[PDB]
Amino acid sequence: LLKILLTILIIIALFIGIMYFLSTRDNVDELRKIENKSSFVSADNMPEYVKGAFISMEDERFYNHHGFDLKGTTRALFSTGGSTITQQVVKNYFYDNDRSFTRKVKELFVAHRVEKQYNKNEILSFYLNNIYFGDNQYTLEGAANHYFGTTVNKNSTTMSHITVLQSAILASKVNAPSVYNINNMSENFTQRVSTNLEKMKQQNYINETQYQQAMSQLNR
């Protein structure tokens, strides 16, 4: 008996070793291809409320972990469905197409590589720069200009910068239901972006004067 559960260990292992060999490759720095994007901006060149508008909702402890976050993985494993900003990256670039257990696992193997190789600001720039804001917008810059006419490059001087409110909108589309329309937001959506403005105030990405600003704006 103690050997039957063993013979199930080495198969999961064999399957995990199977899993590894299949992640290769799937090789970064293919990930660096992103940077050529016409409207590519880098996170260091954005406001900190824009950075946090995503961090706080999606990956509340980004610069901490090294790819995997178990307290959000357990919540996904229903001790309460979160992906690290690193895993989303991986998936979005490579696995944008398919989901399967045999993918989510190797997606852990790949995300590991990208933490090994890149740094947190690089990473988070692939994330913010290859994601869908539901209008055929896959860059935060594209989406920002496209929905509000504002920019996310803090060094910008030609276009008007992006407001606090707007950040929580775009952060909160990223993983909203395909139904959640930024052009016309639902009571259900306009409460989702709020769950967000709270997570930034809470996490200190914004102050109470900025916070009320958005929520008055949201209720405008």
Curated annotation (Swiss-Prot):
It is found in: Cell membrane. It is a single-pass membrane protein. GO terms for cellular component: outer membrane-bounded periplasmic space; plasma membrane. The chain crosses the membrane at residues 4-24. Keywords: Cell membrane, Cell shape, Cell wall biogenesis/degradation, Glycosyltransferase, Membrane, Peptidoglycan synthesis, Transferase, Transmembrane, Transmembrane helix. It comes from the Bacteria. Peptidoglycan polymerase that catalyzes glycan chain elongation using lipid-linked disaccharide-pentapeptide as the substrate. This is Monofunctional glycosyltransferase. It comes from Staphylococcus aureus (strain Mu50 / ATCC 700699). The gene is mgt.
